[PDB]
């Protein structure tokens, strides 16, 4: 049965949970991982970044993902306005071995979850964390502006649908709960929504649509374009299941402003405002149900505290235009494992480690924030030279600067590919468009240097 | 009813390549006569298929009949070349959940194909043996060379029946689907050239009560192939809807000898395949253990003046990657395309015969170098032949070999894999070592 005591409790067996559980268990930590669903289970989020490989490599899962046979993504196209699309190429930057994947999430989350068990973490499914018990930490615990002291969490109550129930004690907590955000939403209450990105989304899977850039060395790559009226944007993501993932994103007010099988109809109506998406789906056959979900973007006032870490959607969320969700989940899961291991064996104080994790979550989120915002500003405009596109017929100059951030660099040190000089130019270029400790990433010696 | 004296196309041999070519031609309205020396249903080896079977069967509208029969669906195949982790090819990953293939009791599918030829409008006769072919001199503008030959034009065939009846039938085109007998290639062109490295022999039997491989996994009970640990050969397990698993071993003719031997060597090769033995741990033999010749061969030419050679009648490669049934029907399609193109004036006969012969050669060459690379890795048990920089197993190699192993790279009906991907499959194996079809029903032929 589930043990009463462990070293680290990881709440939620999603990508950020399984990654943090595996990375800690591969260091020998007595990790317990609790997941309310039994894998495989459906979840949306199939487009990945090339940063997935260095992250998966640290936990020795990269080749297992390669051997599964997901649809490879060599890049992504972004037709923000009526001008010709901008395109980021993964295999050009990282070589012919540097492609990423478009992923059926029911299977990758299983691969990560089973890898956590094979890594030596105690994994349990159908077990839901009902509550967290924060003991008072009445001692000084300073912040740099991104950690909070609701006390120290030391026990969690859990239930299983087969009727068993109990409580588990732990020394550290990893919050990978997801949108539910148990710590951020239900013990803390520090979710800060961005009113400009309070979006809604609808999607479905289609068979027989014909690929983009047929014959071209960029055939059937993921394709994103903004609506010609500027109200939102749509995506196409082809998958190995034989279907292409298709969906549309609109702000909550602008979504019902077009309410003037309703979900299937607005899917077709919003599709009209994307002429190239409209062209690709001409012969398409619908095989999926068309599903709607909330898609609000939010940050948090704190991402860590006394002996607990918040990772992935449990802390922050940004509009999935640049496929940042799965990247930021595992990138924060690595920072949680690094900061916990540093705290465990005395590389630094807990407040030094907890603050370090919270920054790596905050600055990583900030990078995609200003980049996605610049694209969404260009999508909300159409004729105005956002990204400085006045004299050109495309965005290729803009995506030459946005290269490192769009491909997942700029905060996690494990993404060695791009220099911090190039990243700085990615930040400077994007803000003008809108206008210490060091990880020891060695297996068996994970922690922080000064 | 009896065999007619004249027809448009005579198809010799009612195997898969014969029945497919008969159906594809008869569905175009051609007066096709199909002669088969064996009476269906009859036993024949070859039970593992490729996912390319569906686009081929769909062109002749036979997919749904095969689906309704209930063959064991095949989602992929495993290949444990050496003691390292298995390599695996995934059909459902590439072709979707409806793109699986089958493991097939061949006595029943060959009958379905043969009867489908009759429903397609071909005149089908069983127990009728083509004894000889009458090649008239074709001294016209038709040179030899390029995988085409000019032994003259075949225009009549002598035939015999098991009741004693005999006669002769005239035809404008010939389709040689006779098989290993290879009437045209072995006794009229005399152009079968064996590869001395692949002069293999095989033994097999069917076992009941064996337990599935990879139980519980989404890849449970898929066909499993592994090379013998001493490097002498390889074994297979192919589970069938019959509740039994087809089990067999393949050895080179010299290494084979290194009656009762068949039952004993069956156990010895199984012992040299630890995972095959594990699946057959409680198994009981219900079949006879049978031996047959399994030599690999090519031909200097696969077509000529108004005749087409398809399947084993032309070429054969070691069945490690289950290429035999694919290449049979893939060549049968090319024979129907090239004959119809010649019939309706899309191009000259000399242009069509070269196109068919190239598609037989080009398809065979793909599987040749791929099987050769895998069999070299099996004899180099300890040497990395197909092992690249990796963490374990051969699965990275099978990600490169993916399109050829699943039947792409020559047949135009298998669109699934890009022509970019096929190029890397060719280079990967070698480094270890015009006309366009009109695949329209009722408009079959060639464009330029
Ligand atoms: C429409 C849409 C499109 C998207 N497209 C993309 C894309 O293209 N690319 C991309 O990278 N991202 C995309 N995302 C985002 C992506 O879905 C997430 O960012 C990603 O799943 C990372 O979050 P996570 O790791 O927490 O996963 P989650 O699925 O949020 O993991 C949380 C897990 O914890 C479990 N859990 C919840 N409560 C408890 C509890 N009390 N106890 C135990 N377990 C619990 C849940 O069942 C779940 O399995 C998209 C999101 C949306 C809405
Ligand atoms: C041990 C072994 C294992 C194999 N495993 C596989 C496998 O897993 N998968 C796979 O795809 N392939 C496999 N094969 C290959 C497969 O058996 C053949 O490649 C495939 O069946 C193609 O045969 P065919 O239709 O061309 O010839 P056949 O199937 O032999 O058909 C020719 C027919 O014509 C008849 N005939 C012969 N002479 C005459 C004549 N003169 N007149 C009239 N009719 C005549 C024959 O009786 C026969 O019925 C294997 C082969 C061997 C030896
Ligand atoms: Cl992207």
Numbering used by the authors:
A (entry chain B): 2 to 261, 267 to 441, 505 to 519
B (entry chain A): 1 to 258, 266 to 440, 505 to 519
Question: What's the publication's text?
Answer:
Here, a 2.4 Å resolution crystal structure of RadH was obtained using an analogous FDH as a search model, and the crystalline form of this enzyme revealed two largely identical monomers in an asymmetric unit. Each monomer consists of a conserved Flavin-binding domain with FAD bound and a chlorine atom located in an adjacent space. Docking of 6-hydroxyquinoline was performed using DiffDock and suggested that the active site of RadH be the space currently occupied by the flavin moiety of FAD and chlorine atom. While the docked poses overlap with the FAD structure, previous experimental results have shown that nearby residues K74, D325, and F328 are essential for RadH activity, validating the RadH active site proposed by the docking model. The closest structural homolog of RadH is the FAD-dependent chondrochloren halogenase CndH with the lowest RMSD score of 2.39 and 29% sequence identity. Spatial superimposition has revealed highly similar folds between the two proteins, except for an additional omega loop (Y138–P154) in RadH. The binding of carrier proteins is suggested to occur at a hydrophobic groove on CndH next to the entry of the active site. This groove is also where the C-terminus domain of RadH is located (top). As a result, we hypothesize that the C-terminus of RadH has a similar structural role as a docked carrier protein, positioning the enzyme in the correct orientation for catalysis.
In particular, the fungal halogenase RadH from Chaetomium chiversii has been shown to be particularly promising in the tailoring of non-tryptophan-derived scaffolds due to the relatively broad range of reactions that can be catalyzed. Flavin-dependent halogenases (FDHs) have been pivotal in this domain, given their ability to site-selectively install halogens across a wide range of electron-rich aromatic structures. Our investigation revealed that RadH could effectively halogenate hydroxyquinoline and hydroxybenzothiophene.
